Structures are given as structure tokens and as C-alpha cells.
Write a protein that binds this ligand. Structure first.
Ligand SMILES: *[C@@H]1O[C@H](CO)[C@@H](O[C@@H]2O[C@H](CO)[C@@H](O[C@@H]3O[C@H](CO[C@H]4O[C@H](CO)[C@@H](O)[C@H](O)[C@@H]4O)[C@@H](O)[C@H](O[C@H]4O[C@H](CO)[C@@H](O)[C@H](O)[C@@H]4O)[C@@H]3O)[C@H](O)[C@H]2NC(C)=O)[C@H](O)[C@H]1NC(C)=O
Ligand SMILES: *[C@@H]1O[C@H](CO)[C@@H](O[C@@H]2O[C@H](CO)[C@@H](O[C@@H]3O[C@H](CO)[C@@H](O)[C@H](O)[C@@H]3O)[C@H](O)[C@H]2NC(C)=O)[C@H](O)[C@H]1NC(C)=O
Ligand SMILES: *[C@@H]1O[C@H](CO)[C@@H](O[C@@H]2O[C@H](CO)[C@@H](O[C@@H]3O[C@H](CO)[C@@H](O)[C@H](O)[C@@H]3O)[C@H](O)[C@H]2NC(C)=O)[C@H](O)[C@H]1NC(C)=O
Ligand SMILES: *[C@@H]1O[C@H](CO)[C@@H](O[C@@H]2O[C@H](CO)[C@@H](O)[C@H](O)[C@H]2NC(C)=O)[C@H](O)[C@H]1NC(C)=O
Ligand SMILES: *[C@@H]1O[C@H](CO)[C@@H](O[C@@H]2O[C@H](CO)[C@@H](O)[C@H](O)[C@H]2NC(C)=O)[C@H](O)[C@H]1NC(C)=O
Ligand SMILES: *[C@@H]1O[C@H](CO)[C@@H](O[C@@H]2O[C@H](CO)[C@@H](O)[C@H](O)[C@H]2NC(C)=O)[C@H](O)[C@H]1NC(C)=O
Ligand SMILES: *[C@@H]1O[C@H](CO)[C@@H](O[C@@H]2O[C@H](CO)[C@@H](O)[C@H](O)[C@H]2NC(C)=O)[C@H](O)[C@H]1NC(C)=O
Ligand code: NAG
Ligand code: NAG
Ligand code: NAG
Ligand code: NAG
Ligand code: NAG
Ligand code: NAG
Ligand code: NAG
Ligand code: NAG
Ligand code: NAG
Ligand code: NAG
Ligand code: NAG
Ligand code: NAG
Ligand code: NAG
Lengths: 440, 98, 121, 125, 124, 121
């Protein structure tokens, strides 16, 4: 034999590792200035003859992304003004809207005393607050947060628009993308390719419907940590988008109220025009057969003769019973009980979803720090594209030929999981020792 | 398609005798003990792993679908109801006696 | 120091709602799902449903859907959490005892169960 | 073949592209990204310097491929030369000797220390 | 001559004074603190990148170092007689700022070939 | 395996065997911790740069062409290598260190220009 140890430096071998990836991006809540400029032409090196064991649910890029997003939110909310004077007693009447029966109190014309530039003086001012923003103490109300937390008003110049952020690993680390299509979320992947940075991942805060995400490649893909478990949310990724047109048709004029020296409180003054209801339109002929594809792909997991039923949300917070999102700066909460009402047996009309607008937002499931989104002048309309769902099975006695699926809650780690499913971080260990005939 | 099957419907054993309670199932099975309709307690989580504070008399082993619950050196406390659980489904359990 | 107290046993006529309370304290209540179990006398345990503490989302079987409501309430500082189970349409079959259990992991190991609340109809 | 391109290639074919992996080992709070990225950069520099110090301690400083006097123990791997450099890849080989890496590293350090001592005595006389 | 003193001197005159330039390449609680830390990390990374580039070409630990790569005339059509007497390094860098990448790649490939050849020679 | 600094009180003859043990522990690993790590890295790079400037790069024990001036120390080889530890000797050449470092730098400089003159004949 007479083999001897030879040291090779820079061999292509890697192991699983966790590292603080940095952000590259091509005013916002997610700072474009703070992130480095992205590469003009990314490199995708295809690793032939490589099989890699991926895992969606133990991916640490999701946890790091969530921590970075929360910290960006906090950093954006830090320099803005504090609305501690606003937690006072408010005399609230109905905004003049004839008598709409139900939904009449959705806007409340509330008058309150506010502090001025001079500490010794007060001013009687008024503002239009939503019903969800206030709670009764016959006309005495207070903001809903006044016992639980304090509000910081979001800066008006700061925009909540998602920007595509690319997560690049540092030196000595590699990001392996699983180019394989129909790859569920876990286990082997024979089509692998290393990248410098991940694709543009828009941070979109949404519940029951993933918006502005990746559109898959071949077919609708269902991914859950275990299909048998009920507690695990099911992530569905569409192969074609479902367009959704969301609008807040109230003009909603904005006014400035000096609460202190150099501090302003932006408050809705008047709706110029008819008082209407915010909503979202989804195509019916698209959403049906999109649910058809989803049912066809769920029947692979749950059996061929099963009756796949879709029902609306069982209960919970407002962020989970309703599709919550942010459109142009205002926070919509849409019913979506018309979307998820179906029963599938093995064998230019729009769905209008009524949305309630909110201003006092407790983001990232945190309690103890609330935000007050300012009003927005003019009508706001947005066109987003549904690329997926979060779902939850009913469980229980599933021995029967029925399977009820309801929309799932907002953890926001499932939102990042649907985008970072293909990406894994590894550390390259360049040192190696092999046997060869050579000697010193 | 979860299925459960527990073999002893009724069970009587002497003190100091090793007992084996067979529960056949598919998936993550956990063993619990209920005494006289009072609140259960977790003996075994997963196939074999023992919870903290549980007596070492109880242990579990895994082979295929079957789990054994090898309890050794029965004592006056061990006489109680014993049942197996996979997720949301719980079969009615046996009842140790003397 | 994990502790899941439960309310006293209740008696009510059919068709009148109950309010079974389960007070959880001594641990981080938010990360662990709280499930509900129902034991008829002389019968094995049955599952009523889980509730996420963070989001408040219930999940119930088709047998109990439309009747059972799982809710949760948080005090100041969130050290004590009150999980309520309310059955709307009561019936002689529902004569069971109700436990609130704490799932700790993917295993569905219910480490801590409640004392119980005998609901008699 | 680019960075990590020869990952699925055999050991011999991947020994010709050690440079492309060597370069990419070093190519890269006031704000959220500041302190953590700086810590990551310092950690990367520390890892590179630990690797370079390990190479220098074995006498293989500045060499991508370097020979040593340490004999290959048959217990480490009974496989022959042909089925190592033409059959397997670097990933599989690292998975095979994952236990025995530390013993080999210790033997390399001991052998280089002995060689340096012998060279010093030979140069002295 | 001090640090960077031979910048105006001829190339041959600066070959003996390379050492002083080489030495001077290593050396939020406060506004100065984090910025100084980032500057130090940048300096360390630049120095290690230069040292790694030197070591990949086989010139590790040496200021002056021959290489096996031939000086292809496409990079410069000039005579050695007057480069080392009537030219300065800044102008030379200005002429060949555009082919550095391919020359560095050729040096990498040539040293890889040389190391492979040395391994094969030491095998027998 | 004496361990880290284990041969510090033994004579130099046994101390030079364990150079790798103290060499390894120079790279073992808030704002203050980051500054400490950066300073440790810079100190290691200073030492390695000093070694490389004398031509002793990647060599723990390195022989050089610099003659030993008798004025630096009047003692003999056996007394130096078999009576005192490294700490006592370091105390004994505290003020002569910079001159020896400069002479090593000049000698290696002369060596490299001589090598370049020889190889470019
Ligand atoms: C998923 O989708 C389901 C339907 O499929 C929704 O369930 C509906 O929830 C709404 C919530 O507003 C219910 O509407 C309210 O119901 C209450 C009960 O009404 C009847 O109750 C019993 C029926 O057995 C009768 O005895 C009784 O006479 C009532 O007819 C009422 O309290 C409400 O009306 C009162 O309140 C409103 C506002 O306070 C007033 O305007 C009214 O005048 C009145 O005072 C109201 O009608 C609705 O009934 C539910 N439908 C069904 C079929 O159960 C889920 O909410 C939905 N989930 C999500 C998350 O979107
Ligand atoms: C998903 O992505 C779409 C497309 O990027 C987002 O829609 C875009 O939303 C922005 C922000 O509101 C719109 O800009 C606004 O437009 C009007 C003028 O048209 C004006 O009122 C404002 O000054 C502002 O510029 C943008 O037009 C709109 N794009 C389209 C094509 O309509 C959408 O918001 C995303 N959905 C999310 C994050 O849920
Ligand atoms: C979801 O959970 C299920 C169980 O609830 C996991 O099932 C696991 O399936 C694998 C095969 O894919 C089983 O391995 C098998 O083990 C025995 C060894 O005696 C034998 O039958 C087979 O040869 C095979 O090796 C594994 O044991 C089984 N786990 C359990 C607890 O039964 C499934 O992997 C989970 N899916 C996820 C997390 O995506
Ligand atoms: C909200 O209520 C305020 C009063 O609190 C309304 O303001 C008054 O509007 C009338 C309209 O005829 C004016 O004549 C008064 O001078 C206003 N009084 C004020 C400002 O103190 C306001 O119009 C209401 N806004 C609505 C219904 O959108
Ligand atoms: C802050 O005040 C609100 C409004 O009073 C409280 O919400 C109510 O709490 C009571 C007592 O538990 C419930 O019966 C009501 O159903 C709640 N109404 C809701 C949620 O709309 C809220 O709990 C208080 N905050 C605390 C205690 O942290
Ligand atoms: C709506 O979904 C579609 C499909 O992903 C996206 O439309 C694409 O838009 C890009 C430019 O951004 C075009 O180059 C593509 O040709 C479009 N696709 C098709 C099939 O026509 C669209 O971006 C989504 N909406 C968003 C992200 O708001
Ligand atoms: C969400 O919408 C549904 C229907 O769009 C509302 O639930 C009830 O739906 C039934 C038919 O299934 C109607 O007869 C009832 O009138 C609806 N209730 C009401 C109050 O209108 C449901 O209330 C909506 N959820 C909200 C507003 O939170
Ligand atoms: C109007 O506001 C009052 C309080 O002033 C509130 O109780 C009521 O529900 C609202 N709606 C109508 C139709 O009066
Ligand atoms: C505002 O201040 C006046 C001062 O006289 C007081 O009478 C009135 O009740 C106050 N209103 C509110 C809403 O606090
Ligand atoms: C999908 O999940 C199964 C679970 O058993 C696994 O074996 C399979 O490899 C996964 N598919 C892919 C393409 O990774
Ligand atoms: C959404 O609006 C677009 C125009 O922006 C329109 O073409 C499309 O049909 C709409 N989709 C609906 C109503 O589902
Ligand atoms: C949805 O589409 C499926 C498949 O084409 C069809 O069977 C079903 O009737 C449609 N549902 C509607 C129109 O409600
Ligand atoms: C499904 O639920 C929606 C909720 O808005 C309702 O309008 C619709 O009629 C329901 N569909 C059927 C077929 O009953
Ligand atoms: C909203 O109101 C402004 C004036 O405040 C007006 O110019 C604009 O056209 C309105 N927008 C509508 C009605 O969409
Ligand atoms: C993959 O392996 C096959 C033999 O299994 C070989 O022919 C092919 O060249 C390899 N591809 C690479 C190394 O890219
Ligand atoms: C360690 O060696 C044993 C045999 O001695 C082998 O079974 C095992 O796979 C090795 N470890 C790894 C992590 O490969
Ligand atoms: C350039 O300056 C150097 C000294 O720095 C000197 O030797 C040389 O003669 C100068 N050039 C000319 C043209 O005088
Ligand atoms: C390379 O750079 C030089 C100097 O800037 C420039 O003039 C020239 O056009 C470029 N191309 C070639 C082929 O030399
Ligand atoms: C300490 O002194 C003794 C004296 O006999 C000597 O043998 C020994 O080697 C010295 N050093 C150590 C590290 O024990
Ligand atoms: C070096 O010289 C100083 C006086 O300048 C003296 O105190 C010190 O002991 C000397 N160090 C030696 C001889 O090692």
C-alpha cells in the first residue's frame, strides 16, 4: 500500500450551519439604504450529481428573517411620535350616513380634548375613529388599547410597501437552492444549485392567503410538517395566481392636530363623498378550479373517495378570523367566508369580500406595543395576486369520508416558509485529508 | 387513516408480576394512566421515552406497529386504567386488578 | 409550577349553555396548545378540540362543530390565561367530565391535565 | 465549473478546482444589519485564520495540495486508491472519515513537530 | 525614505523599499468606536485577501516572486530596458488596469498545474 | 500532553516540544467583545506578518542567518538551554528585542534580493 496523508485545502464539502445572513436590496419600513446593493447578475451554479437533504420546518433562515423583519419594524417605529395624550375620554356620535341598519357604527365621529404646544392649554378637537379602534366606557368611548398597551403613531412619510430583499450568506457559507419541481418540503433533492443570494422575497404580512409570492413551476403544491397532525398549518402554493382587487372607496381626508412641541397627530377629518365599504374582489371562475386544483392535490394525501369540504374560519382574534393585510398603508381585514365555502365530491362574476379597516395594529402577535397607522388621503386601490393559502384541517374523527379545511392563522413564519422553502444555508469545510502515494 | 387496537379488555395480575399491555397503532403513540376517573398523567411520550418524575417500573419498546408497555414489579399504586393515544384518538383502555 | 386549575362541577338543563373555565399559570402559556378532552362515565376519552393561545384559533371535530366554542382570555402581564369551553346545544348524551390538557410538542404529549369539571345533564 | 461546481464530481476531478473554493472563503447596534453582519465578518475571518494556522502547523502553509510523512492507517479506510479517486466524491469521503479527522490532525501536528526538530538538529551539525 | 516614499522613484529603486509599504497595511458607545471597528475589519479583510491572492499563486510569504505564466505581448508591447529606469508604478498600473483579472486567473491555473505536477512527481 | 502553558516552568529543552500547544490557543475565538476579538485577530496577524517579514513564514522553529551578538547576552548555549526557563530569558533580553527584529528584517531583505539576482541570471 504505502499510502500517506495528503492535505487538500478548498475541497467541495459542506455541513449544516447557522449564520447571520445579510440583506441586499435593488423611506421604506424595510430599509433599502441600510442593505447593500444587490449584484446586477446573480450566479446560479448547478451542482450536478448532488443530492441534498432539505428541511422546510427546521430552516433557520425563517427564524432569522422573522427576527430581522420585527427588528426593522421596531427601528422604523422608534423615531416617530408617541400618542399617549390620545388615551382620553371621547364623546363619539355617528357619522352622518342616513341609517344603514347594521354597519352604521363602523365610523364614529369622536370629540376629545387634546394638549397643545402650550402645556397649560387644551383644545376641543374631533376625529373619525373606526369601531374596531374604540370601545365604550352612552356616548363615552376610549381607544381599545388604553388598558393593554401604548400606541406609537407610524411616521407618515414612511411607507409600508414591501421591497424585494435578497438574503445573501457571508464568506465561507453557501446557499443551496433545490431547483427540483414537485419537491414537497423535506428529504432528498437531486437538483441542487448554489447561489450568492436568494430571490427577491417581498415581506408580505398576510393571513389566510399568501400575497405577492412565488408562483410555483408545475402544479399546486401542498406542504405540511405532518399531514396526519392537525395543529400543523398546511401551506398551499398555486401554480397560477388569483387576482384580487382591494379598495377603500372612502376619500378619508387627513388633518394635523398639534399634540405637543414638534409632535403631530394625523386624524381623519372628513369623508368627501358617499360613505362606502372597503372590499376585495376575486374572480369566481378563477377561484373555482383553483380550489379544484387544490382539492385534486389534497386527495393525493387524504385518499381518492374523500369529500373535501372548505369552510370559513372557526374563530379567534380579528387577525385570524379575517384575511388581514396592508394595502397602500391602511390595514384591511376581509371576511373571506364566500371564498371558503365549498364541498367537493370525487367525480365576469366576482366574489366580493367585505373588509373592515383598522388603525390600532398589534403586529407580530406582540402585546405591549401598538401602532397607529395614519389616515391616507384619497381613495386607495391595490391589485395583488394570491399565490397560496394557509389552511388547517378539522381533525377529530376523520375515519368518515369528509375532510373540512378552514383557513389558517397568522404566525408569519409560515409566510416566510413559503418563500424560503428551496433555500438552505451550509458551511464549506475546506480542509480535507486523503490517502495518496506521495511523501514529503 | 389512524387505527388503534388494544388487546387486553380486562386485566388481573399479582403484585411482583411483569405485565405487557399491547396497543397496535400507526403514528406517534403515547401511554397514559387514569385512576378512577380522576385526571390522567403522562407515563410515556413517543414509543419509549420516559417523562420526568415517572417511576422506572414502566418502560416502552417499539417494533413495527406494536408497543408493549413492559411494566415490572407491580405495586399497590400501579393498579389503574392504562390507555394509548395517537393524536386525537384514544381507545378505551384496560383496567389492572388484583 | 405549571398549574391548570378548572372550575367546579356544573348542573344545567338541556339547551342551556355552560362555561367551563381552565386557568393556566406557572409556564409560558403562549407556545403550547391547550386541548380539551371529554370522558363519558365508563367510556374512553374523546377529543373536543384545541385552541392556539397566541392567535385564539379553535379547531374542533365535525361532531362538535356548531356547538362547542373554545375561547381564551389574558390578564395583565399574561401570567394567567383563562381558556373557556362553551357548549351551546346540550343533550342527555353530553353528561361527561371535561379536562383541559397541555400539548407540549409535535408528539402530542399532554404533560399537564386539569382536575376536571363534571357537566351533568 | 464555478464555485462548488465539482461537488458531485469525483475526488480526483475536484482536486483540480481547489482554487475556485479557496477564493470564495473570503469574498465578503446603529442599524439592524450592522452589528450582526460585522460579527459574521469577524467570525469568517477567524475561521479562515484558524484554517490557515492549522495548515501552517502541519507544514502545508501556502500549499493547496501538500504531502506529509504520516502513514495511512488501514483502520481509517480499507478502500484502495482507485475506488477513492475515481468512485467517490469529497462529501462521501468526509462523511466516511468524520470520526477519524481529529486523530489524523493530531498525527500531522506531531509529525511536523518531529520533522522540524530533526531538520533543526541536522542543520545544527 | 519612509512609507510610500518611493512612489516617485523608479521601479528598481522601489523594489528594495517594498517592505515599508508592506508593513503599513495592518497597523455604538461612541461615534468613533463602531466606525473604527468597521475600518479595522475592512483593513484586516483587505490584507488577508492580498495574502490569499499571494498564496494561491505560490508567492506566499515573499515580496518578490517568479511565476511560470508567460508575459503575453497582448497585455503590453514594451521593452524591459526602459520600464525599470524611466517609469513609475502608478503609470504602469494605469496601463494594465484592464487585464488584471485574466492574468490572476492564469496564475491560479498555472500554480494548480504546478502543484498537481509536484504531487505526481512526489508520488513515484 | 502537558496542556496550555504547561511547559512554562520547565527548561527550554522540554519547552520547545510544546510550541504548537501555545500556538493553537492564540485563535480560540457586545461592542467590547467584538473589539477584543478584532484586537486578538490583529495581534495574531502582526505576529505572523513579523514572521513572514523575516522569512520564517509557517515555521515555528526557524533558523536565520543573523549572527548572535555577544553583547546581547554573555552566557553559553548549555546554560541558556538547560538552566533557565523561557520567562527568565525573556526578562534577560527585554531591551534588545527591537534591534534583533530589525537585523532579521534586513537579513531577510538581503536574502530575497540575492535570490532574485541569482534566479534572474
Ligand atoms: C363563518 O360563516 C358563518 C355562517 O356560515 C358565520 O356565522 C354567522 O355569524 C354571524 C355573526 O354576526 C351571526 O349573526 C348573528 O347571530 C346571532 C344569532 O342569531 C340567531 O340565533 C339563534 C339561531 O339559533 C336564534 O334563536 C336567534 O333568534 C337569531 O336568529 C345574533 O345575535 C345576531 O343578530 C343580532 O345582532 C346584530 C348586531 O348586534 C344586530 O344587527 C341584529 O339585529 C341582532 O340584534 C346576528 O344575526 C350568524 O347568525 C351566523 N350564521 C350562522 C349560520 O350560524 C360565522 O361568523 C363565519 N365566521 C367567520 C370567522 O367569518
Ligand atoms: C402586491 O403587489 C402589488 C404590485 O406591486 C401592490 O400593488 C401596488 O401598491 C402600491 C402601494 O399602494 C400602489 O402604489 C400607489 O398607487 C397609486 C397610483 O396608482 C397612488 O395612490 C399611490 O401614490 C401609490 O403609488 C401601486 O399602484 C400598486 N400596484 C398596482 C399594479 O396596482 C400590492 O400592494 C401588493 N400587495 C400587498 C403587499 O398586499
Ligand atoms: C409524520 O409522522 C409519521 C408518524 O406519525 C412519520 O412516519 C414515519 O415513517 C417512516 C417511514 O417513512 C417510518 O420508518 C419506518 O420504521 C419502521 C422501523 O421498524 C419500519 O416500519 C420501516 O422500515 C421504516 O423504517 C417511521 O418510523 C415513522 N414514524 C413513526 C413514529 O411511526 C412521518 O415521517 C412523519 N412525516 C413528516 C415529519 O414529514
Ligand atoms: C363630526 O362632528 C363635528 C362636530 O363634533 C362636525 O363639525 C361641525 O360640522 C358642522 C356642519 O354643519 C359645522 O357647521 C360645525 O361648525 C362643525 N363644528 C365643529 C368643527 O366643531 C363634523 O362635520 C362631523 N364630521 C362628519 C359627520 O364627517
Ligand atoms: C381592556 O378592556 C377591554 C374592554 O373592556 C377588555 O375586553 C373585555 O374584557 C371582558 C372581561 O374579560 C370580556 O368579558 C369582554 O368580552 C372583553 N371584550 C372584548 C375583548 O371586546 C379587555 O380584556 C381589557 N384588557 C385586558 C384585561 O388586558
Ligand atoms: C400577478 O401574478 C403574475 C404571475 O406571477 C405576475 O405577472 C407577471 O409580471 C411580470 C412583471 O412583474 C411579467 O414579466 C410576467 O410576464 C407576468 N406573468 C404573466 C404570466 O403574465 C404579477 O407580477 C403578479 N402580481 C404582483 C406580484 O403584484
Ligand atoms: C362574514 O360574512 C358572512 C356571510 O357573508 C356573515 O355571516 C352570516 O351569513 C349568513 C349566510 O350564511 C347570513 O344570513 C347572515 O346574515 C350573515 N351574518 C350577518 C351578521 O350579516 C358573517 O357575519 C360575516 N362576518 C363578519 C362580519 O365578521
Ligand atoms: C350610533 O352611535 C350610538 C352612540 O351614540 C350607538 O349606540 C349606536 O349603535 C350607533 N347607531 C345608531 C344606528 O344609532
Ligand atoms: C373637554 O373640556 C371641557 C372643558 O370645559 C369639558 O367640559 C369637556 O367635558 C371635555 N370633553 C372631553 C371629551 O374630554
Ligand atoms: C416528500 O415527502 C416524502 C415523505 O415520506 C419523502 O420521502 C420525499 O422524498 C419527499 N419528496 C421530495 C421530492 O423530496
Ligand atoms: C381586477 O382589476 C383588473 C384591473 O386592474 C381587472 O382587469 C380584473 O379583471 C379584476 N379582477 C377581478 C375583479 O377579479
Ligand atoms: C368548479 O369547477 C369544477 C371543475 O370544473 C366544477 O365541477 C364545479 O361545478 C365548479 N363549481 C362551481 C361552478 O361552483
Ligand atoms: C357559502 O357561504 C357564503 C358566505 O357568504 C354564502 O353566501 C353562499 O351562499 C354559500 N354557498 C352555498 C352554496 O350555500
Ligand atoms: C377625494 O377628495 C379630493 C379633495 O379632497 C378630490 O380632489 C378627489 O378627486 C377625491 N377623490 C375621489 C372622489 O375619488
Ligand atoms: C455524474 O456522474 C456520471 C456517472 O455517474 C458522470 O458521467 C458525469 O460526468 C458526472 N457529472 C458531473 C461530475 O458533473
Ligand atoms: C464512526 O465510525 C463508525 C465505525 O467505527 C461508523 O459506523 C460511523 O458511521 C462513523 N461515524 C460517522 C458520523 O460517519
Ligand atoms: C523622482 O524622485 C526620486 C526620489 O523620490 C528621484 O530619485 C528621481 O530623480 C526623481 N525624478 C526626476 C526625473 O528627477
Ligand atoms: C482597457 O482599459 C484601457 C485603459 O482604461 C482602455 O483605454 C481600453 O479601451 C480597454 N481595452 C483594451 C482592449 O485595452
Ligand atoms: C520543574 O522542576 C523539576 C525539578 O526537578 C523538573 O524536573 C521539571 O521538569 C520542571 N518542570 C515541570 C513542568 O514540571
Ligand atoms: C535593559 O536596559 C534597562 C535600562 O535601560 C534595564 O533596566 C533592563 O534590565 C535591561 N534589560 C535586560 C538586560 O534584559
Amino acid at each position: 500500500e504505502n499510502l500517506w496523508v495528503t492535505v487538500y485545502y478548498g475541497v467541495p464539502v459542506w455541513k449544516d450551519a447557522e449564520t447571520t445572513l445579510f440583506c441586499a436590496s435593488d423611506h421604506n419600513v424595510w430599509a433599502t439604504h441600510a442593505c447593500v446593493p444587490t449584484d446586477p447578475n446573480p450566479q446560479e451554479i448547478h451542482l450536478e450529481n448532488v443530492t441534498e437533504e432539505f428541511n422546510m420546518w427546521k430552516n433557520n433562515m425563517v427564524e432569522q428573517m422573522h427576527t430581522d423583519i420585527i427588528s426593522l419594524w421596531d427601528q422604523s417605529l422608534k423615531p416617530c411620535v408617541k400618542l399617549t395624550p390620545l388615551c382620553v375620554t371621547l364623546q363619539c356620535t355617528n357619522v352622518t350616513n342616513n341609517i344603514t341598519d347594521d354597519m352604521r357604527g363602523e365610523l364614529k365621529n369622536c370629540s376629545f380634548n387634546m394638549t397643545t404646544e402650550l402645556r397649560d392649554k387644551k383644545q376641543k378637537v374631533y376625529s373619525l375613529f373606526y369601531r374596531l379602534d374604540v370601545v365604550q366606557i352612552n356616548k363615552e368611548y376610549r381607544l381599545i388599547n388604553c388598558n393593554t398597551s401604548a400606541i406609537t403613531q407610524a411616521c407618515p412619510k414612511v411607507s409600508f410597501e414591501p421591497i424585494p430583499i435578497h438574503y445573501c450568506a457571508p464568506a465561507g457559507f453557501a446557499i443551496l437552492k433545490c431547483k427540483d419541481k414537485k419537491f414537497n418540503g423535506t428529504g432528498p433533492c437531486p437538483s441542487v444549485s448554489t447561489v450568492q443570494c436568494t430571490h427577491g422575497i417581498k415581506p408580505v404580512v398576510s393571513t389566510q392567503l399568501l400575497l405577492n409570492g412565488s408562483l410555483a413551476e408545475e402544479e399546486v403544491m401542498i406542504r405540511s410538517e405532518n399531514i396526519t397532525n392537525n395543529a400543523k398549518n398546511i401551506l398551499v402554493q398555486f401554480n397560477t395566481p388569483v387576482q384580487i382587487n382591494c379598495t377603500r372607496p372612502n376619500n378619508n381626508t387627513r388633518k394635523s392636530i398639534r399634540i405637543g412641541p414638534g409632535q403631530a397627530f394625523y386624524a381623519t377629518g372628513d369623508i368627501i363623498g358617499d360613505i362606502r365599504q372597503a372590499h376585495c374582489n376575486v374572480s369566481k371562475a378563477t377561484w373555482n378550479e383553483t380550489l379544484g386544483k387544490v382539492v385534486k392535490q389534497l386527495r393525493k394525501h387524504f385518499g381518492n373517495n374523500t369529500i373535501i369540504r372548505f369552510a370559513n374560519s372557526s374563530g379567534g382574534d380579528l387577525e385570524v378570523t379575517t384575511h388581514s393585510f396592508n394595502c397602500g398603508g391602511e390595514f384591511f381585514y376581509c371576511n373571506t367566508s364566500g371564498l371558503f365555502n365549498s364541498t367537493w365530491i370525487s367525480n365576469n362574476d366576482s366574489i366580493t369580500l367585505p373588509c373592515r379597516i383598522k388603525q390600532i395594529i398589534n403586529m407580530w402577535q406582540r402585546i405591549g406595543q401598538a401602532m397607529y397607522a395614519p389616515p391616507i388621503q384619497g381613495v386607495i386601490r391595490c391589485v395583488s395576486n394570491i399565490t397560496g393559502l394557509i389552511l388547517t384541517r378539522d381533525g377529530g374523527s376523520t375515519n368518515s369520508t369528509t375532510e373540512t379545511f378552514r383557513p389558517g392563522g397568522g404566525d408569519m413564519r409560515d409566510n416566510w416558509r413559503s418563500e424560503l422553502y428551496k433555500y438552505k444555508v451550509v458551511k464549506i469545510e475546506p480542509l480535507g485529508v486523503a490517502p495518496t502515494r506521495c511523501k514529503r | 387513516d389512524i387505527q388503534m387496537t388494544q388487546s387486553p379488555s380486562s386485566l388481573s395480575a399479582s403484585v411482583g408480576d411483569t405485565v405487557t399491555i399491547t396497543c397496535q397503532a400507526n403514528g406517534y403513540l403515547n401511554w397514559y394512566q387514569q385512576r378512577r376517573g380522576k385526571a390522567p398523567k403522562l407515563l410515556i411520550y413517543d414509543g419509549s421515552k420516559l417523562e420526568r418524575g415517572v417511576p422506572s417500573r414502566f418502560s416502552g419498546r417499539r417494533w413495527g406497529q406494536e408497543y408493549n408497555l413492559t411494566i415490572n414489579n407491580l405495586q399497590p399504586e400501579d393498579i389503574a386504567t392504562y390507555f394509548c393515544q395517537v393524536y386525537e384518538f384514544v381507545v378505551p383502555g384496560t383496567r389492572l386488578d388484583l | 409550577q405549571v398549574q391548570l386549575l378548572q372550575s367546579g362541577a356544573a348542573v344545567t338543563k338541556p339547551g342551556a349553555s355552560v362555561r367551563v373555565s381552565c386557568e393556566a399559570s406557572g409556564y409560558n402559556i403562549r407556545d403550547y396548545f391547550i386541548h380539551w378532552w371529554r370522558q363519558a362515565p365508563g367510556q374512553g376519552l374523546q377529543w373536543v378540540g384545541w385552541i392556539n393561545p397566541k392567535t385564539g384559533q379553535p379547531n374542533n371535530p365535525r361532531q362538535f362543530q356548531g356547538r362547542v366554542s373554545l375561547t381564551r382570555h389574558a390578564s395583565w402581564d399574561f401570567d394567567t390565561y383563562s381558556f373557556y369551553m362553551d357548549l351551546k346545544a346540550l343533550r342527555s348524551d353530553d353528561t361527561a367530565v371535561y379536562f383541559c390538557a397541555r400539548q407540549r410538542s409535535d408528539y402530542w404529549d399532554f404533560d399537564v391535565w386539569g382536575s376536571g369539571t363534571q357537566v351533568t345533564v | 465549473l464555478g464555485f462548488l461546481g465539482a461537488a458531485g464530481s469525483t475526488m480526483g476531478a475536484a482536486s483540480m478546482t481547489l482554487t475556485v473554493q479557496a477564493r470564495n472563503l473570503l469574498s465578503g447596534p446603529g442599524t439592524v444589519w450592522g452589528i450582526k453582519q460585522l460579527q459574521a465578518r469577524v467570525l469568517a475571518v477567524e475561521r479562515y485564520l484558524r484554517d490557515q494556522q492549522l495548515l501552517g502547523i502541519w507544514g502545508c502553509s501556502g500549499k493547496l495540495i501538500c504531502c506529509t510523512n504520516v502513514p495511512w492507517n488501514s483502520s481509517w479506510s480499507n478502500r484502495n486508491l482507485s475506488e477513492i479517486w475515481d468512485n467517490m466524491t469529497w462529501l462521501q469521503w468526509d462523511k466516511e472519515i468524520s470520526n477519524y479527522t481529529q486523530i489524523i490532525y493530531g498525527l500531522l501536528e506531531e509529525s511536523q513537530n518531529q520533522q522540524e526538530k530533526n531538520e533543526q538538529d541536522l542543520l545544527a551539525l
